[PDB]
Amino acid sequence: DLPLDPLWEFPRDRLVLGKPLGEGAFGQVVRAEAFGMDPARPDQASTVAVKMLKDNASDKDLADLVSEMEVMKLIGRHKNIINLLGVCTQEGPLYVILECAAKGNLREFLRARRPPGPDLSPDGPRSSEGPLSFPVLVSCAYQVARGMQYLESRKCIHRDLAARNVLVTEDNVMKIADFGLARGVHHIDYYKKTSNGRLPVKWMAPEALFDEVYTHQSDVWSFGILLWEIFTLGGSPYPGIPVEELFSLLREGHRMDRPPHCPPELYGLMRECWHAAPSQRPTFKQLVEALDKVLLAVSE
Ligand SMILES: *C(=O)c1nc2c(C(=O)Nc3cc(O[C@H](C)c4c(Cl)cncc4Cl)c(C#N)cn3)cn(CCN3CCOCC3)c2cc1Br
């Protein structure tokens, strides 16, 4: 039905759909096997993520997915974002074939890798040593910033940047997901809590929440929250604060406390990202440079 784009079009019969990975506001994502994604190796298998409409496919759902497809065609390729691999638009359901990140999103990745507690009996020479170390946490933050810097250069705004929207590959490479998506910014239920308990309003910059204004600097605010997530190892922001209290606290200019085991350098970065005036927050370019200095300083 849709026009054929030979640049991106991929034979749907070269896809083998597997287990569903997750579902969104519009569309669901399914793990799948792809054969010959590289045209030079037609019989080579690869694992990809296929986005498709749900079965309650309204025409707004289709429009949103078509919109996401066109954004993915224009955004180009970068190491630190989920890249478009191909599409299926001819003679069958609309598929958007994306890169697959084997380790899930950044939040789940961090939460599954919290250090062993003092309730465990010491076994071996590394009893206290957890999977996560400080330089790696800094690297994760750096990669997200680089990816966001790239998206900004392509004039793209995320509007819901969070640990849950950052994906982790087999090689622990950060990949920003669901970047320039329609998210119904004129009808957000600020009290809406997701199935996993997330309150997305806690990631919104004040100008976005109060004035419905989204800029790259509003993403920087969200990045600050993401920084806090990272160094709490997947903690939920504004701990124990319901949305009603969040409203008043934000109007009073309240900010999150410095989390435990977090160096003042990084909490400093967080607070800069949460400066009230968007122009007094660092740019993503400055965030990359600042995080680079820390990363190089702890990479002897
Ligand atoms: C394939 O590489 C692969 N992917 C995963 C994922 C996974 O999450 N893949 C994934 C999800 C994507 O988007 C969805 C909607 C999503 C989810 Cl499900 C969660 N949070 C954010 C988002 Cl955007 C996209 C996109 N776009 C791309 N890829 C999860 N797993 C398993 C996780 N974990 C593995 C081992 O420990 C137990 C469970 C996989 C596996 C694989 Br092979």
Short mmCIF file of C-alpha atoms and ligand atoms in Angstrom, two decimals:
data_model
loop_
_atom_site.label_atom_id
_atom_site.label_comp_id
_atom_site.label_asym_id
_atom_site.label_seq_id
_atom_site.Cartn_x
_atom_site.Cartn_y
_atom_site.Cartn_z
CA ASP A 1 0.00 0.00 0.00
CA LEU A 2 2.69 2.50 1.02
CA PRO A 3 5.15 3.66 -1.67
CA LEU A 4 8.11 1.34 -2.27
CA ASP A 5 11.47 2.63 -1.02
CA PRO A 6 14.14 0.34 -2.56
CA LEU A 7 16.77 1.98 -0.33
CA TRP A 8 15.28 0.60 2.88
CA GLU A 9 12.81 -2.09 1.79
CA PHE A 10 13.58 -5.61 3.02
CA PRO A 11 11.88 -8.88 1.96
CA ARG A 12 9.56 -9.85 4.83
CA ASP A 13 10.04 -13.53 3.99
CA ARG A 14 13.65 -13.10 5.12
CA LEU A 15 12.37 -12.43 8.64
CA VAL A 16 11.57 -15.11 11.21
CA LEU A 17 9.55 -13.58 14.05
CA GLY A 18 10.38 -14.78 17.56
CA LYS A 19 9.44 -13.84 21.11
CA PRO A 20 7.95 -10.38 21.76
CA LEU A 21 10.30 -8.00 23.58
CA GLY A 22 7.91 -5.27 24.73
CA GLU A 23 4.96 -3.02 23.85
CA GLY A 24 4.65 0.80 23.63
CA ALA A 25 2.02 3.54 23.42
CA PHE A 26 1.66 2.68 19.71
CA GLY A 27 3.17 -0.53 18.29
CA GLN A 28 4.96 -3.52 19.74
CA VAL A 29 8.51 -4.81 19.35
CA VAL A 30 9.30 -8.42 18.49
CA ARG A 31 12.66 -10.19 18.50
CA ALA A 32 13.33 -11.75 15.10
CA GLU A 33 15.91 -13.52 12.96
CA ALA A 34 16.97 -11.86 9.69
CA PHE A 35 18.67 -13.48 6.70
CA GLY A 36 20.85 -11.43 4.39
CA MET A 37 20.41 -8.06 6.09
CA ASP A 38 23.87 -7.61 4.64
CA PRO A 39 23.18 -8.03 0.89
CA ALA A 40 26.74 -9.34 0.44
CA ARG A 41 25.87 -12.29 2.69
CA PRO A 42 22.33 -13.32 1.60
CA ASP A 43 22.17 -16.46 3.77
CA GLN A 44 23.77 -14.96 6.88
CA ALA A 45 21.59 -14.83 9.99
CA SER A 46 21.32 -11.87 12.36
CA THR A 47 19.11 -10.99 15.32
CA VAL A 48 16.99 -7.86 14.87
CA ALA A 49 14.12 -6.05 16.57
CA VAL A 50 10.94 -5.73 14.52
CA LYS A 51 8.45 -2.99 15.36
CA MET A 52 4.87 -3.46 14.18
CA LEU A 53 1.37 -2.25 15.01
CA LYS A 54 -0.57 -3.94 17.76
CA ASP A 55 -3.83 -5.73 16.87
CA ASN A 56 -5.90 -2.77 18.11
CA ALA A 57 -4.41 -0.83 15.19
CA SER A 58 -6.14 2.53 14.95
CA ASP A 59 -5.21 4.75 12.02
CA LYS A 60 -3.43 7.10 14.42
CA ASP A 61 -1.31 4.10 15.43
CA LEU A 62 -0.38 3.48 11.79
CA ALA A 63 0.32 7.18 11.26
CA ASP A 64 2.59 7.30 14.32
CA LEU A 65 4.51 4.21 13.20
CA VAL A 66 4.84 5.54 9.66
CA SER A 67 6.08 8.79 11.21
CA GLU A 68 8.67 6.91 13.27
CA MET A 69 9.81 5.09 10.12
CA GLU A 70 10.46 8.34 8.26
CA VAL A 71 12.38 9.84 11.23
CA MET A 72 14.56 6.65 11.35
CA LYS A 73 15.34 7.03 7.61
CA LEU A 74 16.57 10.65 8.12
CA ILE A 75 18.47 10.37 11.40
CA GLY A 76 21.49 8.57 9.93
CA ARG A 77 23.81 6.06 11.60
CA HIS A 78 25.52 6.49 14.97
CA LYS A 79 27.14 4.02 17.37
CA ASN A 80 25.07 5.21 20.34
CA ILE A 81 21.52 5.11 18.96
CA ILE A 82 19.21 2.34 17.75
CA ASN A 83 19.73 2.37 13.99
CA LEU A 84 17.28 1.58 11.20
CA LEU A 85 18.17 -1.62 9.36
CA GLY A 86 15.25 -1.83 6.95
CA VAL A 87 11.48 -1.73 6.49
CA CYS A 88 8.68 -3.96 5.25
CA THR A 89 5.91 -1.98 3.55
CA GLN A 90 4.89 -4.12 0.57
CA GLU A 91 2.18 -6.80 0.50
CA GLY A 92 1.79 -7.35 4.23
CA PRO A 93 1.84 -5.64 7.65
CA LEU A 94 4.14 -2.64 8.17
CA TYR A 95 7.44 -3.62 9.78
CA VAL A 96 10.17 -1.32 11.09
CA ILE A 97 13.38 -3.33 11.46
CA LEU A 98 15.71 -1.94 14.13
CA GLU A 99 18.97 -3.00 15.77
CA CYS A 100 18.52 -5.38 18.70
CA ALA A 101 20.19 -4.76 22.07
CA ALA A 102 20.81 -8.09 23.78
CA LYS A 103 20.95 -6.83 27.38
CA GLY A 104 17.67 -4.89 27.53
CA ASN A 105 17.39 -1.28 28.68
CA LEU A 106 19.86 0.58 30.88
CA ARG A 107 17.64 0.62 33.97
CA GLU A 108 17.05 -3.17 34.04
CA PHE A 109 20.73 -3.65 33.20
CA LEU A 110 21.86 -1.66 36.24
CA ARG A 111 19.26 -3.10 38.62
CA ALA A 112 20.28 -6.67 37.79
CA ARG A 113 23.92 -5.80 38.49
CA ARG A 114 23.81 -4.22 41.94
CA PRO A 115 26.68 -5.32 44.23
CA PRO A 116 26.26 -8.29 46.60
CA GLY A 117 24.83 -7.34 49.99
CA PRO A 118 26.39 -8.03 53.41
CA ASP A 119 23.97 -10.97 53.77
CA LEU A 120 26.11 -13.19 51.55
CA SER A 121 28.89 -15.48 52.78
CA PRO A 122 32.35 -14.57 51.39
CA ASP A 123 33.19 -17.07 48.64
CA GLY A 124 36.41 -16.53 46.70
CA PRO A 125 38.75 -13.50 46.40
CA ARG A 126 36.06 -11.17 44.98
CA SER A 127 33.18 -11.42 47.47
CA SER A 128 32.64 -7.66 47.74
CA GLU A 129 33.27 -7.00 44.06
CA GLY A 130 30.12 -6.45 42.00
CA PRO A 131 29.72 -6.42 38.19
CA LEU A 132 29.57 -2.62 38.08
CA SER A 133 32.57 -0.33 38.58
CA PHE A 134 32.77 3.47 38.59
CA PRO A 135 34.58 3.93 35.24
CA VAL A 136 31.99 1.78 33.45
CA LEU A 137 29.14 3.80 34.96
CA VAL A 138 30.87 6.94 33.70
CA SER A 139 31.30 5.35 30.27
CA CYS A 140 27.57 4.58 30.12
CA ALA A 141 26.81 8.23 30.87
CA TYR A 142 29.36 9.37 28.31
CA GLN A 143 27.89 7.20 25.54
CA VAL A 144 24.35 8.43 26.19
CA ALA A 145 25.64 12.00 25.96
CA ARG A 146 27.46 11.28 22.68
CA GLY A 147 24.33 9.68 21.24
CA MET A 148 22.21 12.63 22.38
CA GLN A 149 24.76 15.03 20.90
CA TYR A 150 24.35 13.24 17.58
CA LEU A 151 20.55 13.37 17.76
CA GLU A 152 20.77 17.09 18.53
CA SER A 153 22.96 17.64 15.46
CA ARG A 154 20.18 16.01 13.43
CA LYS A 155 17.74 18.48 14.98
CA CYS A 156 16.02 15.71 16.94
CA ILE A 157 14.44 15.94 20.38
CA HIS A 158 13.77 12.88 22.55
CA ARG A 159 11.15 14.35 24.94
CA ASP A 160 11.36 11.34 27.28
CA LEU A 161 15.05 10.61 27.79
CA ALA A 162 15.47 8.06 30.57
CA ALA A 163 17.39 4.91 31.58
CA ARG A 164 14.39 2.88 30.34
CA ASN A 165 14.83 4.37 26.80
CA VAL A 166 18.54 3.59 26.68
CA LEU A 167 19.39 0.12 25.42
CA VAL A 168 22.45 -2.01 26.17
CA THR A 169 24.11 -4.24 23.56
CA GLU A 170 26.11 -7.44 24.03
CA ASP A 171 29.26 -5.31 24.30
CA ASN A 172 27.72 -2.90 26.81
CA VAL A 173 27.35 -0.13 24.23
CA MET A 174 24.66 2.42 25.07
CA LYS A 175 22.01 2.89 22.38
CA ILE A 176 19.31 5.54 22.68
CA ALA A 177 15.90 4.16 21.66
CA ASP A 178 12.52 5.72 20.70
CA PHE A 179 14.02 9.21 20.05
CA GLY A 180 11.84 11.26 17.70
CA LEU A 181 8.49 9.59 18.47
CA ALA A 182 5.01 11.05 18.70
CA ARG A 183 4.27 11.06 22.42
CA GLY A 184 1.08 13.14 22.61
CA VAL A 185 2.64 16.05 24.46
CA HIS A 186 -0.63 18.01 24.55
CA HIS A 187 -2.44 15.27 26.46
CA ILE A 188 -0.10 13.76 29.04
CA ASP A 189 -1.65 12.12 32.09
CA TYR A 190 0.97 13.30 34.58
CA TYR A 191 -0.42 10.87 37.17
CA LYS A 192 -0.11 7.88 34.83
CA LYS A 193 2.03 5.11 36.29
CA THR A 194 3.29 2.40 33.93
CA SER A 195 2.92 -1.34 34.51
CA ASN A 196 6.44 -1.43 35.96
CA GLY A 197 5.68 1.51 38.22
CA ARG A 198 7.34 4.36 36.31
CA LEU A 199 6.08 7.94 36.59
CA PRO A 200 7.35 9.57 33.34
CA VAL A 201 6.52 13.05 34.67
CA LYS A 202 9.61 12.80 36.90
CA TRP A 203 11.85 13.07 33.78
CA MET A 204 10.19 16.24 32.36
CA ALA A 205 11.98 19.59 32.45
CA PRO A 206 9.93 22.34 34.16
CA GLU A 207 9.36 24.22 30.90
CA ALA A 208 8.09 20.99 29.36
CA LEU A 209 5.85 20.08 32.29
CA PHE A 210 4.50 23.57 32.99
CA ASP A 211 4.67 25.29 29.60
CA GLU A 212 4.70 22.35 27.15
CA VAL A 213 7.99 23.61 25.70
CA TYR A 214 10.49 21.07 24.38
CA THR A 215 14.04 21.98 23.35
CA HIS A 216 17.38 20.16 23.33
CA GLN A 217 17.96 21.82 26.71
CA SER A 218 14.83 20.12 28.05
CA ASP A 219 16.47 16.84 27.07
CA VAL A 220 19.54 17.94 29.05
CA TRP A 221 17.33 18.16 32.14
CA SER A 222 16.15 14.62 31.42
CA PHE A 223 19.78 13.57 30.96
CA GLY A 224 20.45 14.88 34.45
CA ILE A 225 17.74 12.58 35.80
CA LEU A 226 19.31 9.75 33.76
CA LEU A 227 22.66 10.53 35.39
CA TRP A 228 20.98 10.10 38.78
CA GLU A 229 19.50 6.78 37.62
CA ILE A 230 22.91 5.52 36.52
CA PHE A 231 24.69 6.31 39.79
CA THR A 232 21.86 4.93 41.90
CA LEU A 233 22.23 1.79 39.77
CA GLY A 234 18.71 1.99 38.35
CA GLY A 235 16.96 3.84 41.16
CA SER A 236 13.64 5.64 40.73
CA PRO A 237 14.01 9.46 40.87
CA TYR A 238 12.42 11.62 43.58
CA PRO A 239 12.17 8.63 45.96
CA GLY A 240 8.78 8.27 47.65
CA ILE A 241 7.39 11.48 46.20
CA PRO A 242 3.94 11.23 44.58
CA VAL A 243 3.14 13.38 41.53
CA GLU A 244 1.07 15.91 43.53
CA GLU A 245 4.02 16.61 45.82
CA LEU A 246 6.35 16.68 42.81
CA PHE A 247 4.37 19.59 41.34
CA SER A 248 4.73 21.80 44.41
CA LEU A 249 8.34 20.80 45.08
CA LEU A 250 9.32 21.70 41.52
CA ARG A 251 7.54 25.05 41.83
CA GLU A 252 9.61 25.59 44.99
CA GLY A 253 12.72 24.66 43.02
CA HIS A 254 13.38 21.43 44.90
CA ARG A 255 16.07 19.12 43.53
CA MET A 256 17.13 15.55 44.29
CA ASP A 257 19.78 14.92 46.94
CA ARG A 258 23.27 13.66 46.18
CA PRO A 259 22.97 9.85 46.06
CA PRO A 260 25.36 7.61 48.07
CA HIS A 261 28.70 6.54 46.55
CA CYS A 262 28.43 9.37 44.02
CA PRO A 263 31.45 11.67 43.56
CA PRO A 264 30.80 15.44 43.72
CA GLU A 265 31.90 15.82 40.09
CA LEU A 266 28.89 13.89 38.80
CA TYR A 267 26.33 15.29 41.22
CA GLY A 268 27.68 18.65 40.08
CA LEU A 269 26.82 17.70 36.49
CA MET A 270 23.33 16.65 37.60
CA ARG A 271 22.66 19.97 39.31
CA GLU A 272 23.87 21.84 36.22
CA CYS A 273 21.40 19.85 34.12
CA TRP A 274 18.67 20.89 36.56
CA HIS A 275 19.33 24.63 36.46
CA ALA A 276 15.97 26.40 36.15
CA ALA A 277 17.00 28.49 33.15
CA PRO A 278 17.50 26.19 30.12
CA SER A 279 20.35 28.41 28.91
CA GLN A 280 22.23 27.83 32.17
CA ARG A 281 22.23 24.06 31.68
CA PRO A 282 25.19 22.53 29.83
CA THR A 283 24.76 21.57 26.19
CA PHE A 284 25.18 17.92 25.23
CA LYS A 285 28.46 18.88 23.57
CA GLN A 286 29.66 20.28 26.90
CA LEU A 287 28.33 17.20 28.71
CA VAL A 288 30.30 14.92 26.41
CA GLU A 289 33.48 16.93 27.00
CA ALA A 290 32.95 17.10 30.77
CA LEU A 291 32.21 13.38 31.06
CA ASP A 292 35.18 12.63 28.79
CA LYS A 293 37.56 14.34 31.21
CA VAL A 294 36.25 12.20 34.07
CA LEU A 295 36.34 9.03 31.96
CA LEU A 296 39.96 9.63 30.85
CA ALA A 297 40.93 10.54 34.44
CA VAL A 298 39.78 7.09 35.75
CA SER A 299 41.02 5.01 32.75
CA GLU A 300 44.80 4.66 33.62
C1 LIG B 1 17.95 -8.81 20.63
O1 LIG B 1 19.25 -8.22 20.54
C2 LIG B 1 17.59 -8.93 21.97
N1 LIG B 1 16.93 -7.93 22.58
C3 LIG B 1 16.59 -8.04 23.87
C4 LIG B 1 15.95 -7.21 24.69
C5 LIG B 1 15.49 -6.01 24.33
O2 LIG B 1 14.97 -5.26 25.16
N2 LIG B 1 15.67 -5.76 23.02
C6 LIG B 1 15.27 -4.64 22.40
C7 LIG B 1 14.16 -3.87 22.78
C8 LIG B 1 13.82 -2.73 22.05
O3 LIG B 1 12.78 -1.89 22.35
C9 LIG B 1 11.84 -2.30 23.37
C10 LIG B 1 10.44 -1.75 23.07
C11 LIG B 1 12.23 -1.87 24.66
C12 LIG B 1 12.13 -2.80 25.70
CL1 LIG B 1 11.56 -4.40 25.38
C13 LIG B 1 12.49 -2.45 27.00
N3 LIG B 1 12.95 -1.16 27.27
C14 LIG B 1 13.04 -0.23 26.24
C15 LIG B 1 12.68 -0.58 24.94
CL2 LIG B 1 12.83 0.64 23.71
C16 LIG B 1 14.57 -2.38 20.93
C17 LIG B 1 14.24 -1.21 20.16
N4 LIG B 1 13.99 -0.28 19.53
C18 LIG B 1 15.65 -3.16 20.56
N5 LIG B 1 15.97 -4.29 21.31
C19 LIG B 1 15.83 -7.76 25.89
N6 LIG B 1 16.41 -8.96 25.82
C20 LIG B 1 16.54 -9.95 26.92
C21 LIG B 1 16.97 -9.26 28.23
N7 LIG B 1 17.73 -10.16 29.13
C22 LIG B 1 18.68 -10.99 28.37
C23 LIG B 1 19.48 -11.88 29.32
O4 LIG B 1 19.03 -11.68 30.67
C24 LIG B 1 17.62 -11.98 30.78
C25 LIG B 1 16.83 -11.02 29.90
C26 LIG B 1 16.88 -9.13 24.58
C27 LIG B 1 17.53 -10.15 24.02
C28 LIG B 1 17.91 -10.07 22.68
BR1 LIG B 1 18.84 -11.50 21.84
#
